[PDB]
Amino acid sequence: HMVIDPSELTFVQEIGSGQFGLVHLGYWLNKDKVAIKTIKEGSMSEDDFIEEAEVMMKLSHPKLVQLYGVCLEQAPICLVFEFMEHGCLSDYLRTQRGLFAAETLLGMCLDVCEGMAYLEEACVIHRDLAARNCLVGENQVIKVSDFGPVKWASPEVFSFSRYSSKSDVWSFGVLMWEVFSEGKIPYENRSNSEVVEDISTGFRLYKPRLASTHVYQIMNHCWKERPEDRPAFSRLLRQLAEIAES
Numbered sequence: 001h002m003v004i005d006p007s008e009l010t011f012v013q014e015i016g017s018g019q020f021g022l023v024h025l026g027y028w029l030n031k032d033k034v035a036i037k038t039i040k041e042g043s044m045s046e047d048d049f050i051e052e053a054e055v056m057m058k059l060s061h062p063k064l065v066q067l068y069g070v071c072l073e074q075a076p077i078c079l080v081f082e083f084m085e086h087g088c089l090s091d092y093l094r095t096q097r098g099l100f101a102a103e104t105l106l107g108m109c110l111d112v113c114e115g116m117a118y119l120e121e122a123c124v125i126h127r128d129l130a131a132r133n134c135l136v137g138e139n140q141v142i143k144v145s146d147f148g149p150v151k152w153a154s155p156e157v158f159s160f161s162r163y164s165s166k167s168d169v170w171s172f173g174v175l176m177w178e179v180f181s182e183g184k185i186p187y188e189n190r191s192n193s194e195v196v197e198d199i200s201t202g203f204r205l206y207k208p209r210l211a212s213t214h215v216y217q218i219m220n221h222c223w224k225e226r227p228e229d230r231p232a233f234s235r236l237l238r239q240l241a242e243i244a245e246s
């Protein structure tokens, strides 16, 4: 539980919600800007919160959002993360649409891939890798969050709820699509059924204009019907890294 926080927290304004709790922009010790995630009483068992926080504090990577600590003396319970200045990647891409060079967008994908490669190696399955679950820090660094939606699901996921790092990769491909379309909604005008049919028939998200043919190729490797046919994040990372240089 590396560092338990009492009330050295200043709650400034809330920024999120949804039974689980509320999210607040705050300050710890009147100095460090933080995002405080509080949990609604009786919205999560205590051992789930406890075992979850320990996992997130055991994980450490430059591309994974860091935790300052947790509050559990009850008041209610909460998690204290470092504050990511520019919010969620989805919102960021949308409001900044038209101001991105392709290199920038590719750089964003590489950030996410590094954090994902790290989690992969740590045998951690994300299960909800989407641009909305990624955060933008100052200088456009992207960090994966919420690491500890059939539009992002691989076939074995909407069929067997069979999660793995390989299903995460598929999700990463869709995230790549979100990044290059500059925040567009994938399969915006299609129901679950239509998405499942289209995907099952071999259709894939169209190539965004900012996505080079080489970037799109990688996106399609992530969307290979067979998990074993998709590259592991460790491999993807180097593929993206080479393309980035041109």
Ligand SMILES: NS(=O)(=O)c1cccc(Nc2ncc3ccc4sc(-c5ccccc5)cc4c3n2)c1
Pocket: 015, 016, 017, 018, 023, 035, 037, 065, 081, 082, 083, 084, 085, 086, 087, 088, 091, 135, 145
């Ligand atoms: N998430 S947001 O409201 O777009 C936003 C705006 C401006 C700055 C941030 N920064 C930040 N930094 C570190 C974080 C680390 C934890 C969480 S959980 C969360 C959330 C959850 C459930 C619904 C809505 C938001 C945002 C953040 C978080 N957020 C977030």
